[PDB]
């Protein structure tokens, strides 16, 4: 791995990741999509600043925990710096070759699962948004997802979803959506209690 991305499962094994709190059904409901043979591309929808990624780290935690159903026991999750992909290369033709080389890497029993955070930044390689765009997964994914090569997970906001996703019928027959909402002022209190110790850094009252 370790090419413009990070293995979250590897960190999870080490215990380097904070416990995800109060997200119970919302996380494992996600498994209810992944376990299917087709129609298996869940995206988390909601506004920013809601612990959006915290769901997927909690998913990795559960996978290590043996909480998941048997369908996804043997897989791992890698998060990808979409926005910095062109940083890894000098020429965009070489860029596209490296991009397809990812699919080339994605043959290991599907044990690799790609995660992102800006789906609109994925839907490029064309005029999916704005006036133009640089080459990206779009010109490669459209078949690959149709032919079941990949499984991606999220993630984006409400308006991005209705403006970009519901317009390409190709995604319609592969993708699914999961609602995310900010919690109440009890779980927030719990999360803050969890973080509390971090700010020993500032040599003031905890």
Q: Which residues bind its own copies (CB under 8 A)?
A: 28-29, 31-33, 35-39, 65-71, 73, 81, 83-84, 87, 90, 93, 97, 100, 140, 142-143, 159, 162-163, 169, 198, 201-203
Cβ proximity to ligand AGS: between 151 and 156 the closer is: 156
User: Is there a contact between 22 and 183 (Cβ–Cβ < 8 Å)?
Assistant: yes
Give the C-alpha distances (Å, rounded to integers) separating 69 from 33, 64, 177: 11, 12, 20
Cβ proximity to ligand AGS: between 98 and 151 the closer is: 151
Beta bridge partners of 186: none
Site size with ligand AGS, rule: CB under 6 A? 13
User: Is there a contact between 114 and 153 (Cβ–Cβ < 8 Å)?
Assistant: yes
22 binds ligand AGS, rule: CB under 6 A? yes
Structure tokens at 119: 């789906």
Judged by CB under 6 A, the stretch of 48-56, 59-67, 83-91, 97-105 that binds ligand AGS is 48-56
CB of 148 to ligand AGS, least distance (A): 10
Q: In whole angstroms, what is the distance from residue 73 CA to residue 15 CA?
A: 18
Burial of residue 203 (number of CB atoms within 10 Å: 0-12, 13-18, 19+)? exposed
Which residues, 50 to 69, sit near ligand AGS by CB under 6 A?
50-54
Judged by CB under 6 A, the stretch of 21-29, 93-101, 104-112, 196-204 that binds ligand AGS is 21-29
Omega cis (within 30) before 155: yes
CB of 194 to ligand AGS, least distance (A): 6
Contact pick of 7, 28, 53, 111 for Mg ion (by CB under 5 A): 53
42 binds ligand AGS, rule: CB under 6 A? no
Q: In whole angstroms, what is the distance from residue 160 CA to residue 164 CA?
A: 6
Structure tokens at 116: 């992102």
The contact set with Mg ion (CB under 5 A) reads: 53
């Amino acid at each position: 791995l370790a090419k413009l991305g990070r293995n979250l499962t590897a960190e999870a094994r080490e215990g380097k990741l904070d416990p995800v709190i109060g997200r119970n059904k919302e996380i494992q409901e996600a498994s209810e999509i992944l376990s299917r043979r087709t129609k298996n591309n869940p995206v988390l929808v909601g506004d920013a600043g809601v612990g959006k990624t915290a769901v997927v780290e909690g998913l990795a935690q559960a996978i290590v925990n043996g909480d998941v159903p048997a369908a996804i026991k043997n897989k791992e999750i890698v998060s990808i710096d979409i926005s910095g992909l062109e940083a890894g290369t000098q020429y965009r033709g070489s860029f596209e070759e490296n991009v397809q080389n990812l699919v080339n890497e994605v043959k290991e029993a599907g044990n690799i699962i790609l995660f992102f955070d800006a789906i609109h930044q994925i839907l490029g390689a064309g005029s999916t948004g704005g006036d133009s765009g640089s080459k990206g997964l779009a010109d490669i994914l459209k078949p690959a997802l149709s032919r079941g090569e990949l499984t991606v997970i999220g993630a984006t906001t409400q308006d991005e979803y209705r403006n970009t996703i519901l317009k390409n019928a190709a995604l319609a027959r592969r993708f699914n959506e999961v609602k995310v909402n900010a919690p109440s002022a009890e779980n927030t209190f719990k999360i803050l209690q969890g973080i509390r110790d971090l700010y020993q850094q500032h040599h003031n009252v905890i």
